[PDB]
Amino acid sequence: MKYMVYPQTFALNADRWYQYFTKTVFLSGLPAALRAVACDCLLQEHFYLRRRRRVHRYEESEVISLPFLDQLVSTLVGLLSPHNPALAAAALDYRCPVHFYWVRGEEIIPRGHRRGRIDDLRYQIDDKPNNQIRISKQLAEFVPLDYSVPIEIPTIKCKPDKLPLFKRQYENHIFVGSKTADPCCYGHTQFHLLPDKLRRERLLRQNCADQIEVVFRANAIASLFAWTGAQAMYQGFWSEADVTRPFVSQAVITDGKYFSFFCYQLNTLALTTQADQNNPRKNICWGTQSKPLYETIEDNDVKGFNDDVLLQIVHFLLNRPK
Amino acid sequence: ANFVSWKSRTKYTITPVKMRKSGGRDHTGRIRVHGIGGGHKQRYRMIDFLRFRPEETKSGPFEEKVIQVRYDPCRSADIALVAGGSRKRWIIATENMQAGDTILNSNHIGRMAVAAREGDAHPLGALPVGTLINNVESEPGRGAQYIRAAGTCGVLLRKVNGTAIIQLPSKRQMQVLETCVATVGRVSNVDHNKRVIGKAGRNRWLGKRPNSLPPMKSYV
Amino acid sequence: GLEEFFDDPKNWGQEKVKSGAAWTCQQLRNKSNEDLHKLWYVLLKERNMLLTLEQEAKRQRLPMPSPERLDKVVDSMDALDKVVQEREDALRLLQTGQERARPGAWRRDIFGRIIWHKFKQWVIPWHLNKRYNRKRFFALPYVDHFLRLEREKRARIKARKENLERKKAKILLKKF
Amino acid sequence: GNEYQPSNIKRKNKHGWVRRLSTPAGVQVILRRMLKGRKSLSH
Amino acid sequence: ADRMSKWTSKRGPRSFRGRKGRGAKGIGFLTSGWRFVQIKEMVPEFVVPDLTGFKLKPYVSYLAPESEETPLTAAQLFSEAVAPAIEKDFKDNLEKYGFEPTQEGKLFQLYPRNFLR
Amino acid sequence: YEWGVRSTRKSEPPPLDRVYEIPGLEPITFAGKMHFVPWLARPIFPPWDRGYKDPRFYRSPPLHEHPLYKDQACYIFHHRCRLLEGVKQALWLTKTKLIEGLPEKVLSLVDDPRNHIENQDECVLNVISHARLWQTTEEIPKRETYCPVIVDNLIQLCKSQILKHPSLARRICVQNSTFSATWNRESLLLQVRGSGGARLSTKDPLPTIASREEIEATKNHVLETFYPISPIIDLHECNIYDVKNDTGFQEGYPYPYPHTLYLLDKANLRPHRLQPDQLRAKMILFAFGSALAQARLLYGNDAKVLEQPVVVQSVGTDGRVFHFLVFQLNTTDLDCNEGVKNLAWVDSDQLLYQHFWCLPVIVEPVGPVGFKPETFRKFLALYLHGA
Amino acid sequence: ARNVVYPLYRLGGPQLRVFRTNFFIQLVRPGVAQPEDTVQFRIPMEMTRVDLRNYLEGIYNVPVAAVRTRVQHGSNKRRDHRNVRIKKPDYKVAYVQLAHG
RNA sequence: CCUCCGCAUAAGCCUGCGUCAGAUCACUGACAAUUAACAGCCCAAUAUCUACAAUCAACCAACAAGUCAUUAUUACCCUCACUGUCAACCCAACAGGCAUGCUCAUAAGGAAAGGUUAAAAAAAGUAAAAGGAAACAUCACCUCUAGCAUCACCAGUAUUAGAGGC
RNA sequence: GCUACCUAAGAACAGAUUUAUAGGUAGAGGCGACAAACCUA
RNA sequence: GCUAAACCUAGCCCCAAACCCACUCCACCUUACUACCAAACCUUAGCCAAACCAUUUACAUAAAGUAUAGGCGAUA
Ligand SMILES: [Mg+2]
Ligand SMILES: [Mg+2]
Ligand SMILES: [Mg+2]
Ligand SMILES: [Mg+2]
Ligand SMILES: [Mg+2]
Ligand SMILES: [Mg+2]
Ligand SMILES: [Mg+2]
Ligand SMILES: [Mg+2]
Ligand SMILES: [Mg+2]
Ligand SMILES: [Mg+2]
């Protein structure tokens, strides 16, 4: 059996419980013609294109915003091609998922013919950001390998059912977005577009005031541990043999009305109970507050270009291995 | 006991459709025919009975170009799906009717006989008496019912004033009017009788479970 | 404020909740409609308190502190509902006067018996209602023997009860 | 032998109420059970 | 081969479970992508007033006296409501008295009823 | 014999009784009660209407009362439009000349080895492994998702090769592209409404390919029509039409001049896909459609010789097999069947590989099979063609 | 809103309000260990999840965020002196996860 | 020491070795459970396209002749409802079966010896000198009937359809 | 609803194969590689 | 001695008279116990009894079990 952790999660206060399922460190912060091009893409999918089907909010981001972020990422790669040479050797997969297995949890199943015995409480996370840039050289570490920190991660309070989840059977796919045979082992960055059903407008219809931040942080942490375990598997490591060089990841998550960034220095490619005793190491997932880039909708062009957004896009898009 | 009939479409189209078999079972649900039905799966395409069917905003003869005789399970001879103007129609291929040839359907009955092609179809007044014929109709515009099996042929035994008389594939005389159109020559898939299955696999695959002269006919 | 979902914490453990009797119907009938809404909401709160307390008492497997209180609040709420129904009935009687509040009829069903069917609020009309036309509400002559048999069973129970009562009366008079 | 391999869809088909009420002899069957006064008036 | 139970949720296969439900009232509609859209229009709407300052407590004190069960008789209530208006008007066409020809324009009609409980 | 039996057709109406035929008296029908039943006379209701206006059942108004239904029906070319006679039919409808072999005006950029990617065949094999091997979670994906992803991969490779020169950096590629246009040819009116892949546009148009001497020589070029099959077949009979020209982009759009288009059939079945000559003709027709759309966007419906010939390229991809072409039109008097006409230079069967082998034998190598990167050199040259 | 036919609604009807909703409620202690931010209840057989949110907002004005529904079939292995299958009171339970911590 | 099973969904049953107490190789009453993204539950009219199999699909190689595609025009704005989720489970004798996805003995799971003694007759296995048995269907073929259409034959036309023989 | 035969529409590996599901043929019957076999001890 | 026995009285029995049954709110002909879109009448048959079998044969009191009819054989 395996528990299921959907990327665009629904639950309230879900960052903490997903974090206990992730055992990462949760910290705040960070580890030209582009504004015109971005406004051009926004106007293209917003106003410069004539929509044959009437624009239904039944596909609100599904008709506009996904192509918007796609245009932004593709043109951003094209523009910053002069800046970061590794981007030439980089693949830009679009709307493709990757899969990995988390292994943590131990408790006797409560009532039935399998009573009392220890059962390997596995879980399978398979998910897609909107567009992923994949690098052929593994990125350097943000903090040091096993760089300690003062605070401790929140711990589970009860069983894995009292929070919103379910446990099914599905095939244990552990995939980087591709098989092992592809050349591009690590990744460059990632671009995630939120699902519609947890919209910030819908969150405003809901009573959940700040937890959009929890939502963004959680889906980012999921993607981060995902790409990192993909790194660990493609690096030949195992729970049978712990990985040493730091798992480095970077990603962007967007919901159209805002943008956010995240980064990952993952450490525990083995997080299972049989090794959790001899486990002084700890992973970290860094991310700061989400912020709005595109502000309003005029008739022709947009205004109020939040230049921190494209600057951080370049900043996460520029780093390279030494 | 509410099985709807398989031929549910009424409009002609170029493609076949999924039809529901009977297997010898009647609409009272019991097998009325022994050893019938249940072959490999095949779809039903509209087979045009009228060789010269006038199209929209048109009249008189018309030519067309064929695509390919493929082995259609709906017929025993080869197939000629042919496009002409803006209309496509699948007919039965003749003895000498190949892809790339142009087929012209004419209805005009000339004063004398008309030296038509091998797979050409014309009215009974536009053909010589004693010519090999296939796809014989029974009335003008009713559709080519008679002489349509693979390799069959019929000879127009006599021609009278506004009438033709042809020996059917059972050597039976059929006398129809001159207003009926028929195709010249013999049908395709010749020597289909001269064939050996070898085993019962093909006969069972033919939709079959195990088992449990005449006077001159007239139509004018 | 979830604090009302349990009862008053002060009265806990006192073995009895000193509550008055239910509101008299005619006495409650003198209150305003807005006051009626207020009373119904207060009744809802107290009844919820009662249900939670009783279920918790089952969870603690102990006796109830005020067992009559729950049913009393239920009875008072029912009386308030009776007053509301009386006022709505007075409105229906005055304004149009139709007898059963829902519009409906007496008819016969496919089981052959006489009943009162209820019409249902539905959009499409009775000349096109794809479901209502499927309702076979017709009975041909094939319901005769069963209908008279139903009459026979009814009569059998009738004579049975009458014989039982009068014979019991005869034994009763024999006892005097 | 395991002959009784019942299935709920086919159960409510071959023993349901709509089919048992589709032809008037079944209506008579319903009435016969009714004057018999059972509980499971259909299946 | 069991029949005496009720027909609640758990009976048979997937869709056979799918159609029926327990005693709810439907709220939405089913449209494309097997996606349900539930309008705020057809939803339940329970707007209770403010309870502050109403002096009528949930229970009534036993010190009060008893009365007679005066059922709301339709003629009695009608007389009590229409007595002054008719008394003035006859001292002075029932539209002045408020007689309703049809309730087709009212929010809370009676025949049929559109109010709730 | 008329097609279709009457058994699964509508039920025949039973005879209305003579009670309804009574000249004086209206019969006591089933109106007062609610029972479509045998014990009375049948209610006869008039034609009622649903007064309410709601999305759920609002039926369309009749298509003779429609606000736009012209007597001259449009022969339409859509994304499913499989032409009849192949590229002969396309040349007949669009009135275009075909020249075997690619046009040398852009092909001269592919002569020098300086315009080449480093380890170009290796990166091509990398795209091949990404597409045919490493696309999805499945062991071996079908070409239905792979080939459009392969087009995306080649487009990304072209976008990434922009470090050498910023010229194509002044170009963008947009999706969800649906243009539409009208053309009056010989006697008929045609409308092409196409939604395709890889709307590749830029700010200024590329220059003309051939000289105006070839344009004058196009008067001698004659459209080989088909007989008796007229070249108006295999369209969509839009009996209700609306006269317009659709550039596919609204106003305020920077860089709106089209350059090239990419097409493929993502079908699970070869029967569900366009045939190879048919797909080539489909690309040619969509090319002519986007060309006429740009012509209407620039100077409108002036049926004459345009001052600057509008030219664009396109390519179809079969998963490994590709067929590219470039077309240059200069005249718009499509009703006239003579004079200057469009010209086309094509290179078909420019495959990426012969096939793909996903598993070994026992032996043969694993991966792409029959790979030829010279066609990939041609495609990458077309990616920078006219810039 | 139990034990009554609600009014028929069309595309654009009025907001069907309530007057004195009869659908009482009962929220009990959790039985197994549960997270802190949710309180569950044994709601009656009728009302919707959004209805539970609305009833809570009316009664106490709670910050309802998430709503949950599970249909606990009553058991049917317990017999009376006539030895018949007598199913228990079946119950559908609900849970409202409250917001703002 | 066993495990050709086991784990899941499917169907199908209906809370059925969960908890606190009774005493019935040593079941009864009360209390608590299963909080969905998976699966159902659907899809605003009228017309109009829909020959180019699949087998790694590029060849060869065919027959049993192919298991899946919209488009045109009009009308249309509001969002997360309801219901399945457990378990040692189902049909039968008082021997057996169960569709489908993964692990081919394994991470999961399971206990054939109640205790003794060491009889024959039986059952199962091991070992033994020396010898080594002291009719129906059917392809192929033949015959016969039937010159033709809207519910089977058949959406067929005597190289066809049906019936007999070997 | 087992089984016999058929239809619809799926599945496994090499056919006169088996099978998950719905549906159809009612005894004066159907079905039947005809066993004078079956169709609920 | 135990198992056991035994106990009246539940209510049934026939009649007399008399004409009865069908709306707490709700839902209830689709898979009955779920709030919602475009069709009916067509003669009962048969044994039994004829010592087997066939035409024939049933499904207030009084005339009178006489007049009518029977493989003129059984009876009605
Ligand atoms: Mg639920
Ligand atoms: Mg879902
Ligand atoms: Mg389970
Ligand atoms: Mg073990
Ligand atoms: Mg044992
Ligand atoms: Mg022993
Ligand atoms: Mg021996
Ligand atoms: Mg020996
Ligand atoms: Mg069956
Ligand atoms: Mg006798």
Curated annotation (Swiss-Prot), chain A:
Keyword terms, alphabetized: Mitochondrion, Ribonucleoprotein, Ribosomal protein
Location of the protein in the cell: Mitochondrion
Q: Name one GO molecular function term.
A: RNA binding
List cellular component terms (GO): mitochondrial inner membrane; mitochondrial large ribosomal subunit; mitochondrion
Q: What is its main location?
A: mitochondrion
Give the protein family. Answer: Belongs to the mitochondrion-specific ribosomal protein mL65 family.
Q: What's the protein called, per UniProt?
A: Large ribosomal subunit protein mL65
Q: Which organism is it from?
A: Homo sapiens (Human)
Ranked from the top, the taxonomy reads: Eukaryota, Metazoa, Chordata, Craniata, Vertebrata
Full-protein residues shown here are 89 to 430 of 439
UniProtKB/Swiss-Prot annotation, chain C:
Show which stretch of the intact protein is covered.
63 to 238 of 250
**Keyword Ribosomal protein annotated:** yes
Q: Does the keyword ATP-binding apply?
A: no
Cellular component terms per the entry's GO annotation? mitochondrial inner membrane; mitochondrial large ribosomal subunit; mitochondrion
Single GO term (MF): structural constituent of ribosome
Task: Please provide the Gene Ontology terms (biological process) for this protein.
Answer: mitochondrial translation
Q: What is this protein called?
A: Large ribosomal subunit protein uL29m
- What is the annotated localization of this protein? Mitochondrion
**Domain of life where this protein originates:** Eukaryota
- List UniProt keywords, sorted A-Z: Acetylation, Mitochondrion, Ribonucleoprotein, Ribosomal protein, Transit peptide
From Swiss-Prot, chain D:
Q: Which domain of life is it from?
A: Eukaryota
Transmembrane feature ranges:
none
> Where found?
Mitochondrion
Q: Which residues carry this modification: Phosphoserine?
A: 22
User: Into which family does the record put it?
Assistant: Belongs to the bacterial ribosomal protein bL34 family.
The record's subunit annotation is: Component of the mitochondrial large ribosomal subunit (mt-LSU). Mature mammalian 55S mitochondrial ribosomes consist of a small (28S) and a large (39S) subunit. The 28S small subunit contains a 12S ribosomal RNA (12S mt-rRNA) and 30 different proteins. The 39S large subunit contains a 16S rRNA (16S mt-rRNA), a copy of mitochondrial valine transfer RNA (mt-tRNA(Val)), which plays an integral structural role, and 52 different proteins.
**What is the designated name of this protein?**
Large ribosomal subunit protein bL34m
Recite the lineage of the species: Eukaryota, Metazoa, Chordata, Craniata, Vertebrata
Q: Which gene encodes it?
A: MRPL34
- Which span of the entire protein is present here? 50 to 92 of 92
From Swiss-Prot, chain F:
What family is this protein classified in? Answer: Belongs to the mitochondrion-specific ribosomal protein mL37 family.
UniProt source species: Homo sapiens
Sorted UniProt keywords: Mitochondrion, Ribonucleoprotein, Ribosomal protein, Transit peptide
Subcellular location, record wording: Mitochondrion
Q: Which molecular function terms from Gene Ontology are attached?
A: RNA binding; structural constituent of ribosome
Name a Pfam family for this protein.
PDCD9
Biological process GO annotation list? mitochondrial translation; translation
Indicate the quaternary assembly. Component of the mitochondrial large ribosomal subunit (mt-LSU). Mature mammalian 55S mitochondrial ribosomes consist of a small (28S) and a large (39S) subunit. The 28S small subunit contains a 12S ribosomal RNA (12S mt-rRNA) and 30 different proteins. The 39S large subunit contains a 16S rRNA (16S mt-rRNA), a copy of mitochondrial valine transfer RNA (mt-tRNA(Val)), which plays an integral structural role, and 52 different proteins. mL37 forms a heterodimer with mL65.
Which gene is this protein's source? MRPL37
Q: What is its main location?
A: mitochondrion
- The name this protein carries in UniProt is Large ribosomal subunit protein mL37
Q: Looking at the UniProt record for this protein, which Gene Ontology cellular component terms does it annotate, in alphabetical order? A: mitochondrial inner membrane; mitochondrial large ribosomal subunit; mitochondrial ribosome; mitochondrion
